[PDB]
From a paper:
Porphobilinogen deaminase (PBGD; EC 2.5.1.61), also known as hydroxymethylbilane synthase (HMBS), is the third enzyme in the heme biosynthetic pathway. PBGD catalyzes four consecutive reactions to convert porphobilinogen (PBG) into hydroxymethylbilane (HMB), a linear tetrapyrrole heme precursor. The holoenzyme (Eholo) carries a dipyrromethane (DPM) cofactor, which is covalently linked to a conserved cysteine residue (Cys261 in hPBGD) through a thioether bond (Song et al., 2009). Mutations in the HMBS gene are associated with a genetic metabolic disorder known as acute intermittent porphyria (AIP), giving reduced heme production and severe metabolic and neurological symptoms (Bonkovsky et al., 2019).
In agreement with the ESI FT-ICR MS analyses of wt-hPBGD, a fully reduced covalently attached DPM occupies the active site cleft, showing a ∼120° angle between the pyrrole rings, instead of the coplanar conformation of oxidized DPM (Azim et al., 2014). The crystal structure only represents the Eholo-state and is denoted as wt-Eholo hereafter. The variability of the electron density quality as well as elevated B-factors indicate a dynamic nature of the residues Leu257–Val263 that constitute the cofactor-binding loop. Electron density is missing for the first 18 residues at the N-terminus and for the active-site loop residues Ser57–Lys74. Unfortunately, surface exposed residues in flexible sidechains, including Arg167, are not described in the electron density maps. The crystallization of the wt-PBGD was performed from a mixture of intermediates, and the heterogeneity of the sample, as well as the flexible parts of the enzyme, such as the N-terminus and the loop including residues 57–74, most likely affect the quality of the data.
Author numbering: 17 to 57, 75 to 357
Amino acid sequence: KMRVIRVGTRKSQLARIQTDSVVATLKASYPGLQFEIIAMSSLFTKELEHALEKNEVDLVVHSLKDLPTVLPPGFTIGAICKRENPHDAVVFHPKFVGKTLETLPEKSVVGTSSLRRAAQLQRKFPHLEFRSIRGNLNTRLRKLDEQQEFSAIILATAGLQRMGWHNRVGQILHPEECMYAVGQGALGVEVRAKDQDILDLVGVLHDPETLLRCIAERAFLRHLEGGCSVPVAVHTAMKDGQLYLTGGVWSLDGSDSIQETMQATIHVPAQHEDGPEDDPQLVGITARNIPRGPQLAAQNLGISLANLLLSKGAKNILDVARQL
Ligand SMILES: *Cc1[nH]c(Cc2[nH]cc(CCC(=O)O)c2CC(=O)O)c(CCC(=O)O)c1CC(=O)O
């Protein structure tokens, strides 16, 4: 009568690397336990979810920014892992290595299929062109270097780092240039919402500071009626007992913009707990072993900033962008 922890992965390289980093952390906490990785084949979220409900697998690893602020019923995010670098990065064509976006020749084409990235970068760099680029990270790096269309592309720093492409990171974008997506750089572990055994085990992965930052960022996004699909961006930081949250929305061209910052006293809790089970998820995340007070406070900060943005016309900016 054995028990093996079954871990679902997409077989794509980056998804597989993320899965292994999490399994490695679990093995270190649970050396006496057995894990089995089950390769399978954004439809991919659906099918890995399908295997979870069909009980073919026990946990799957996502980039947090790829999960929506409300998960389908019967699933939850049981762990938010310690955040890697959240910043967007510029990769340059070999001809332009050493340059910045500030020093590219006028009318260079920058590749990105993110509405958030294009809107912010258009606003700050009027003399540049931004055009859609499709594919995974290696395919985008290929189309940048071999085809002569693009002079640069935008990618998450975290993804390049995980892929072993740290050296192609040419410039790391600051918040004044491009704020990042909600939950960028953090990994989220999705599990069956009722599965207390697996929820127990993966709970060891929660990093308190990352969990609180991502609750505030996801609550901001959810209250604005947003997902991966909208031109919304954020910056969070925890220092000296303060949780800072900057949030922004943009027209698809970046000409219209509301951006404000708010803060609150949330101390990063050092202790673990065994909170009650009937405590519901917060923005899709189950963290019963972290003190709940700081979580609720982070959720309120997100909501407060969304309300401030909405009172300055955010819903109009977002509804106008969506219809295009
Ligand atoms: C919301 C969104 N997801 C992606 C594709 C994606 N998802 C995860 C990563 C790696 C970074 C991480 O784990 O946080 C990536 C790739 C990347 O952002 O570099 C995108 C990118 C669409 C595109 O520009 O082609 C987005 C949109 C967004 O970030 O706003």
